[PDB]
Amino acid sequence: SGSLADAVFKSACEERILLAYADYNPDMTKVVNLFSKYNETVNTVRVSNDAVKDILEIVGWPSMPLIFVKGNCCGGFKELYQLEESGFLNEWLKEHEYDLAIVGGGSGGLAAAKEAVRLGKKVVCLDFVKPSAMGTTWGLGGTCVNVGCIPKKLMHQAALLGEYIEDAKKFGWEIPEGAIKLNWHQLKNAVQNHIASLNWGYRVQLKEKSVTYMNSYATFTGSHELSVKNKKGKVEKVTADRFLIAVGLRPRFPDVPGALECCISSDDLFSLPYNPGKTLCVGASYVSLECAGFLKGIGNDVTVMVRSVLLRGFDQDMAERIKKHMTERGVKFVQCVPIKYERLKKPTDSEPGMIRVHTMQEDEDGTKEVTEDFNTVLMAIGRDAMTDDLGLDVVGVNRAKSGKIIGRREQSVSCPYVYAIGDVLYGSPELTPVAIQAGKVLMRRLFTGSSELTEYDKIPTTVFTPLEYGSCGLSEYSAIQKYGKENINVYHNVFIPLEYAVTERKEKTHCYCKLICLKNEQDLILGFHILTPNAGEITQGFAIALKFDAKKADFDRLIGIHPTVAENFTTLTLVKE
Amino acid sequence: SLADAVFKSACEERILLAYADYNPDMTKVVNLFSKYNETVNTVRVSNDAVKDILEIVGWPSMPLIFVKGNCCGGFKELYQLEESGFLNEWLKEHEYDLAIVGGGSGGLAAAKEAVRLGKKVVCLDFVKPSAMGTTWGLGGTCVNVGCIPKKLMHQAALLGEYIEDAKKFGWEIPEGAIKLNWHQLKNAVQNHIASLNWGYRVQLKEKSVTYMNSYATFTGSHELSVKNKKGKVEKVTADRFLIAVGLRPRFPDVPGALECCISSDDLFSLPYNPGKTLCVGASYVSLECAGFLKGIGNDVTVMVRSVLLRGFDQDMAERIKKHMTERGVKFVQCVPIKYERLKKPTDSEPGMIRVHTMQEDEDGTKEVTEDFNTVLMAIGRDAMTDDLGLDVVGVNRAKSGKIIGRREQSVSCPYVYAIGDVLYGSPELTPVAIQAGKVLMRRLFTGSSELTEYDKIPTTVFTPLEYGSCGLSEYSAIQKYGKENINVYHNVFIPLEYAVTERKEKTHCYCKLICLKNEQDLILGFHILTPNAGEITQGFAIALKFDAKKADFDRLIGIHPTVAENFTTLTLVKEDG
Ligand SMILES: Cc1cc2nc3c(=O)[nH]c(=O)nc-3n(C[C@H](O)[C@H](O)[C@H](O)COP(=O)(O)OP(=O)(O)OC[C@H]3O[C@@H](n4cnc5c(N)ncnc54)[C@H](O)[C@@H]3O)c2cc1C
Ligand SMILES: Cc1cc2nc3c(=O)[nH]c(=O)nc-3n(C[C@H](O)[C@H](O)[C@H](O)COP(=O)(O)OP(=O)(O)OC[C@H]3O[C@@H](n4cnc5c(N)ncnc54)[C@H](O)[C@@H]3O)c2cc1C
Ligand SMILES: Nc1ncnc2c1ncn2[C@@H]1O[C@H](COP(=O)(O)OP(=O)(O)O)[C@@H](O)[C@H]1OP(=O)(O)O
Ligand SMILES: [Au+]
Ligand code: NA
Secondary structure (H helix, E strand, C coil), rough: CCCCCHCCCCCCCCCCEEEEEECCCHHHHHHHHHCCCCCCCEEEEEEHHHHHHHHHHHHCCCCEEEEEEEEEECCCHHHHHHHHHHHHHHHHHCCCCCCEEEEEEEECHHHHHHHHHHHHCCEEECCCCCCCCCCCCCCCCHHHHHCCHHHHHHHHHHHHHHHHHHHHHHHHECCCCCCEECCHHHHHHCCCCCHHHHHHHHHHHHHHHEEEEEEEEEEEEECEEEEEEECCCEEEEEEEEEEEECCCCEEECCCCCCHHHHHCCCCHHHHCCCCCCCCEEECCHHHHHHHHHHHCCCCCCCEEEECCCCCCCCHHHHHHHHHHHHHHHHCEEEEECCEEEEEEECCCCCCCCEEEEEEECCCCCEEEEEEEEEEEEEEECCCCCCHHHHHHHHHHHCECCCCECECCCCCCCCCCCCCCHHHCCCCCCCCCHHHHHHHHHHHHHHHHHCCCCCCCCCCEEEEEECCEEEEEEECCHHHHHHCCHHHEEEEEEEECCCCHHHCCCCHHCCCCEEEEHHHHCCCCEEEEECCCCCCHCCCCCCCHHHCCEEEHHHHCCCCCCCCCCHHHCCCCEECCC | CCHHHHHHHHHHHCCCCEEECCCHHHHHHHHHHHHCCCCCEEEEHCCCCCCCCHHCCCCHHHHHHCCCCCCEEEEEHHHHHHHHHHHHHHHHCCCCCEEEECCCHHHHHHHHHHCCCCCCCCECCCCCCCCCCCCCCCCHHHHHCCCHHHHHHHHHHHHHHHHHHHHHECCCCCCCCCCCCEHHHHHHHHHHHHHHHHHHHHHHHHCCCCECCEEEEEEEEEEEEEEECCCCCEEEECCCEEECCEECCCCCCCCHHHHHHHHHHHHCCCCCCCCEEEEECCCCCCHHHHHHHHHHHCCCEEEECCCCCCCCHHHHHHHHHHHHHHHEEECCCCCCCCEEECCCECCCCCEEEEEEEEEECEEHHHHHHHEEEEECCCCEECCCCCHHHHHHHHHCEEECCEEEEEECEEEECCEECCCCHHEECCCCCCCHHHHHHHHHHHHHHHHHCCCCCCCCCCEECCCCCCEEEEEEHHHHHHHHHEEEEEEEECCCCCCCCCCCCCCCCCCCCCCEEEEEHHCEEEEEEEEEEECHHHHHHHHHHHHHHHCHHHHHHHCCCCCCCHHHHHHCCCECCCCCC
C-alpha cells in the first residue's frame, strides 16, 4: 500500500513540484510534459487509499490526483493548465525577493509574521492606516491594539472602578464625601500611553526577529508583484512566492445626510481630545453597547438608537437581560433610526461640538418629524472590508458581495499562493484570538507540512457590557430550531456575587447563568451563557468542556471553588420549562 | 442480576443477601433473622458485576448482607452485630430515618437532599463557644467564621487597592489619607452572616427538617442524648446517623496562648480594630488573614517555624511570600515561647500582648520580647470528638479525632456515616462536604452507585494576590514520574486592569502547566498567581476530568482581553530555575 498524509504533506513542503496520486490515472505524462517546458523536475507520491479521504478533506479538493507547487496545493491538471495558459505559472516558478508577503500589521498579520520567521523564512510585513473621515490615524498593531479590545477594556475598567468607589464606602473605607467626577483628559492620555508602548513593542519585536516592516499601503500590480505607497507618497515594488491578506475591516457608515460629516466612530473615540458629553450611539452591535456602557459609567448622559433587536447573532434572552440592566443603569434605548444629522457647532479642543439628530416619530393620529441635540454621535452599525483598491482582480482573488475574500479554508478559492485570515476571510468570526490562531497554524501548515486546522466552532466570547456577558456554543433558540423543544433541557439559576452582598448594587437582581443540553444524548452540552462580573475569566476555561463533548453529568461531578461565581455551573438543578 | 439491580433491591428491601455461588452458613444467617420474624430476600449476582459491587461497598469477599439499605459485610460482621445486641435494637422502629449531627456545610446539604427523597430527618447544631467566649448561629464554619466573612474582608482589602487605581484612570478623588473603619466592615459582614443564619433556619422549617439547637452525644446503639443551651436534655432515635461535626482552631501547649491569643472564630466579630497584629502559623488561614489585615492598613507580622502552605506547590508559596513581603507583611522563622497580657481589650479598643521569642546574637542565644495589640493563632484545626460517645456505638477514630471510614461509612459500624472535615483524609473544603453529603443521601435512599470524586480538586488561596491550583505540584509530578518525563510550561503576564498603574502585582503574576512528556503532555496540574484566580481555575479544572493534553489547551480559542487566555498560548519550558 502507498504513503500516509504525514509523508505526503512534508514531501509537499520539501519538494519544488509534487504530484500526489492513488492509481496511475492518465494525464500524469501531460503534467511532466507541462513542467518539461520550464526545465523543472517533478517529484511524485503514491498515496494509500486508507489516506485519500483525509488528504482531500484537509486541502479541500474533490478528486484523487493533486499537484503542489513550492509547497502550495493547486488542485488537479484542470487548475494547473489555467495557471500556465494565464502565464501565472511561469512568473510563479521564478525566484522572488520574499518567501511570504503579509498585507496587514494586525493581530493575524503580526502573529503570522512572527510564526513564519520562527520557521526560518524571509518575510515582509506591510501596515498602513488610511485615516478616519475626521482624520484620525495610529501606529502598528491594527484594530485590537489601537482602536479595539485594548482601549475599550481599559475604558470599561475605568467605568467599573467608578462603581468600586461606592462599594469601598459600604465596606468601611472613609472616603471624603462630595461627588467624584472622571477627568476624560487623564483617562485618554493614560490609555494612549499604553497604546504607544504596544505600538513600540510590536515595532521592536519585528526588528528583533529579523522581519522586514514597511509602513506602506499595498496593491497587487502583478501575479507576484505588490506596489506599495508610503506616507511621503514614495512607491516601491515588492515580490514574493506567497501572499497573506490580513487587512481586517473599518467602521461602516450609512448612506444618510450628514453621517460622515457629523458622527465619530470606534477609530475616533479612543483618542478624542474632549469629553464626548451627551452622547448618542447608533447601532445594536457589541461595539455600540460596550461603549454606550462605559460613557454612562464615567458620568455621561448616553442614548442608544437601535433598528430592531440588540446583539443580532447572540442569545436574544441574554440580549434582553442586558437591555433591562443597562436600562436600570440609566442608559436610554429607542426604536428610531436617524433620517439626517445636522452640525450646530464644531468641537474645539477641551470642548465637544453639538449635533442635531432628526428622527420621524409616530403617535396615534399622525407621523411627525422630531429633532434632539447631542454633543457627540457614535456611528456603530457595522465594520466592512475595504478591499476595492487592493487590485485582487489582478491576481484573480474572488471576493464575496461584502469585500471579504472567499477561501478554501484560508487559501483563496481562485488563486493557490494567496491566503487570507482574520476579519477579511469570508465567514471568519471577527475576534482577535481567531486571527492569531489562524495565522500561527496556517504558517505551520505551509512551512512544516502539518495537518493542524484552526477550530472555528464552539468559540467562547465575552461582551464587555456594564455587567459582562460570557457565552460558548449554541443559543437557546439555535438549539431548539435545530433539535426541537422536546429534546433540549435548559438548566439555569440566578445568584448574587458575594462582592455585591453588602452593597445596594442594581447588578444584584440581574446576574444569571444557563446551560443548554441535548436531552436525547445524556444532556450533552451545546452551549452555556452567563451574565456576571468577570464573565471573561469564567467562560474561557469552561469552554474547553465543549472540546470533549462534556455532559451535564460532568459539570455536576466537578467540585466547586468556594466562594466564586464560577461554582454556580457545578450545581444547576432547576429546568427552564 | 447486575450492580444497579442489586443496589435498588437493597434500597427497596428490609433485609437482602447477595451471593454468586451459594456457600454453607447461609442457612445459619436466614435462621438468625428467623428469630426476628424477618423475611430475608436474596440475589444471584453475575461474575461480571462482582468486582464492581465489592469495589463500591468496599468489602473484600463474595457474600453480602444489607439491612434497612445499609451494607453490613459477610456473616462474620453480622454475627458481631447480633452477639453485641445491636442487630435486635437496629431492627426496631425508630423516631427518625436519619439523625444528622452538625448544622454545617455537609449537614445542611445532606438534610436538604434526604428530605427531597421524602425521609424523616433531624438536624442537630450547637456552637461550643471560643475560649474568649465567641458563639454564632446556624450554617457552621463557612457561613459564620470561614470562607464567607474571610472573602468579604479580602474584598475590603482589594477595594483599598482599587481606590488607588481609580485615580490613575482619571477619577478625581479628594487627596488626603483614606482610613478604613473596622466597626463598619465588621457590622457589614455580621449583617450578611445574620441573613444567612436566618435563611438556613427558615429553609429547614420550609422543607420539613426538624432542627434542634442542642449538642449531641451517643448514649445507645441508636440513641443520641442532646443538651440545649438552657441545660434541657432530650433523647433522639434513628435508623441511621451522619456525623458532620467538622473541626475547631488548634492552640499550642505554650504559656498564655489560650489567655492572650484570638482565633479565626473570634476575628470576624471583634468589637475592636485588631491593630498591630502577629499571625502564628503558615496555614492558608494565617496567610489569607495576614493578607487582608495588611490590606486594611494594620502593621502585620507572620511567625512560621517551617515552610509556608505545607501541602501546596512550594514554588508558588515562595512567590506569594515575596509579593506579600513587597506589600509590607513581615515574615519571621521564630516560634513564641510565652505570651504575656499587658492590657485587656476594652471600650472598642484592642489590648496589648508581649510575645517572648528566643533569638541568637554573635557570641550566644538570648530571650527577646515584642509588643503586639492582637495575636491570632492559625496553627491548624482539630476534631473535638471525645465528648461524642463514639466509643458507645464503637465508631473507630484516627489518632486525631477524625472518623475512619469505608468510603463515608464508619469502618466499624454500618449504620453510622461521616462527611466533610471530620472524615479521615477528606479534603477540608466547603464544596467537598456538600457534594459528599448530597451524593451519600442519593446512594443510601435511591441505591445509586455514584461516588464523590475526591481527586483533582481545584482550590484558591485568597492571599492579597490570589493563588489558584489544580492537580499535582511540580514537585509531586517529579517525585512520581521523574524529571526526564515532566514538561513544565509557564509564562509571566500583566493583567490589563494593572497596565496604567504602578501596582507591585505587575511583576508577580505567573501561571504554569505540568505535563507527562511520555503520554502526549497529559496535564497533571496547573497553578496561577493572579487577580480572580478562583474564577479562572474552576472551569480549567474540568479539563482534568477528561485527561486533557497540552494540545487541547493550545487548540482552545482564547477570550481577549482576559488573564485566563494565557493558558491557551504557553510555549516556554521551565529549565530548572
Ligand atoms: C471597538 C472594537 C472592539 C473590539 N473588541 C474586541 C474584543 O473585546 N475581543 C476580541 O476578540 N475582538 C475584539 N474586536 C475585534 C478585533 O479587534 C478584530 O477582529 C481583530 O483586530 C482583527 O485582526 P486582523 O489582523 O484580522 O485585522 P486588524 O486588526 O484590523 O488589522 C489589519 C491591519 O491591516 C492594515 N491594512 C489594511 N489595509 C491595508 C493595506 N492595503 N496595506 C497595508 N496595511 C493595510 C489596517 O490598517 C490594520 O493596521 C473589537 C473590534 C472593535 C472595532
Ligand atoms: C478561616 C477559614 C477559612 C476557610 N476558607 C475556605 C475557603 O475559602 N473555601 C473553602 O472551600 N473552605 C474554606 N474553609 C473550610 C470550611 O470552613 C470547612 O471545610 C467546611 O465548613 C466544613 O464543613 P463541615 O460540614 O465539614 O463542618 P462545619 O461547617 O464545621 O460544621 C460543623 C458544625 O457542627 C457543630 N457541632 C460540633 N459538634 C456537635 C455536636 N456534638 N452536636 C451538634 N453540633 C455539633 C459545630 O459547632 C459546627 O457548627 C475555611 C475554614 C476556615 C476556618
Ligand atoms: N507550635 C507551632 N508553632 C508555629 N507554627 C506551627 C505550630 N504548629 C503548627 N504550625 C504551622 O501551622 C500550620 C498548620 O498546621 P497543620 O496541622 O495544618 O499542618 P499540615 O497542614 O502540614 O498538616 C503548619 O504549616 C505548621 O507548620 P509546620 O508544618 O512547620 O509545623
Ligand atoms: Au518543510
Ligand atoms: Na456539617
